[PDB]
Amino acid sequence: GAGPEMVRGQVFDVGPRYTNLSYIGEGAYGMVCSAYDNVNKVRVAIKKISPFEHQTYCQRTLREIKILLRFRHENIIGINDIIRAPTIEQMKDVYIVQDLMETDLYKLLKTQHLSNDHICYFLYQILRGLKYIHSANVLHRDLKPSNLLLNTTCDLKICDFGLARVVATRWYRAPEIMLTKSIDIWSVGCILAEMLSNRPIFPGKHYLDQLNHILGILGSPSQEDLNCIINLKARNYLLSLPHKNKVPWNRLFPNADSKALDLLDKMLTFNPHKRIEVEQALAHPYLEQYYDPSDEPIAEAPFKFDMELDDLPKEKLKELIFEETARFQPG
Numbered sequence: 001g002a003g004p005e006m007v008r009g010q011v012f013d014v015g016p017r018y019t020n021l022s023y024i025g026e027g028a029y030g031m032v033c034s035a036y037d038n039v040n041k042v043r044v045a046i047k048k049i050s051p052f053e054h055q056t057y058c059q060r061t062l063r064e065i066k067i068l069l070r071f072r073h074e075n076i077i078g079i080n081d082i083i084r085a086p087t088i089e090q091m092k093d094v095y096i097v098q099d100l101m102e103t104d105l106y107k108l109l110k111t112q113h114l115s116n117d118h119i120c121y122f123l124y125q126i127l128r129g130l131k132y133i134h135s136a137n138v139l140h141r142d143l144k145p146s147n148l149l150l151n152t153t154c155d156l157k158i159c160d161f162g163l164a165r166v167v168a169t170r171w172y173r174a175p176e177i178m179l180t181k182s183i184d185i186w187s188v189g190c191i192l193a194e195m196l197s198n199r200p201i202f203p204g205k206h207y208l209d210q211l212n213h214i215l216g217i218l219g220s221p222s223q224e225d226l227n228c229i230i231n232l233k234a235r236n237y238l239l240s241l242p243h244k245n246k247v248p249w250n251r252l253f254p255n256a257d258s259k260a261l262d263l264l265d266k267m268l269t270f271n272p273h274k275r276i277e278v279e280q281a282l283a284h285p286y287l288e289q290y291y292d293p294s295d296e297p298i299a300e301a302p303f304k305f306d307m308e309l310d311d312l313p314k315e316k317l318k319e320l321i322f323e324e325t326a327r328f329q330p331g
């Protein structure tokens, strides 16, 4: 009769069903472990979250759970089970049990050089999942290599819907946020450029520095690029800077597929109104060997929070989380 499991200090109370726990990753208010499921006889992923001390985290937790419960797609992580205390008073932690993936794009690009065909295949799958997300009228807002999970057969699944909506990792952040579905396309362009070189394309240290990196490759902005209700400090700064020449894609990425760079160019478009859309991305020549619109499903209906979660006190959100996960409790 073994007690509570433990990984790197903190307790994982996942009972007799889930054992053999092993560290695989972490977040701002939780940790993800692999575990042996003694019912399905496979290893699974278990995401522990402890968000109740903060309203923002309770929001993120509830959003993710709701979205993932609803969503059903081959390239998006699902939820198989949820564990928490039998009463709300003892609920200090929530455990989301999910399909175990082998690794993520972050770690893979750390150790491995991708061939053009695998770059092409990963990008196809990113866009195939994103299409579904966007068809549901949801924005992911935090697309980046560590939120892309992979298995042995090169299948890919998008994870971490905490920031998702009907403040994020700066390197992959669209320019307009620092100055809509188009923000997710920018992030995907950033990811594509990273698969092509194994390095982040715009590794900025803070918001203005982030804009500086983007402009150091795209060149100084046109007036039409800039006229868009920008923050006054940013606009004053951007106007102050010396001219920057555009660096040609084929010079940043010397051995890259020419079709890949054409799509890159269309994703990394400064003006969000000019930037390529997910369905258009899928239909670009570069993805042609994989493009199959009868095998790229959309969500059954757009997603909707009928409660305005932003205004809700964290005690109310905790009650909602208790209610949302009741369906998984014994009985």
Ligand SMILES: Cc1cnc(Nc2ccccc2)nc1-c1c[nH]c(C(=O)N[C@H](CO)c2ccccc2)c1
Pocket (backbone or CB within 6 Å): 024, 025, 026, 027, 028, 029, 030, 031, 032, 045, 047, 048, 049, 077, 098, 099, 100, 101, 102, 103, 104, 107, 146, 147, 149, 159, 160, 162
């Ligand atoms: C759900 C999942 C399944 N399988 C794997 N495999 C894996 C990934 C990297 C290395 C080795 C194996 N990972 C996951 C998973 C990865 N990240 C998350 C996740 O939701 N992370 C967020 C931060 O990105 C998070 C974690 C804990 C608390 C709050 C947020 C789940």
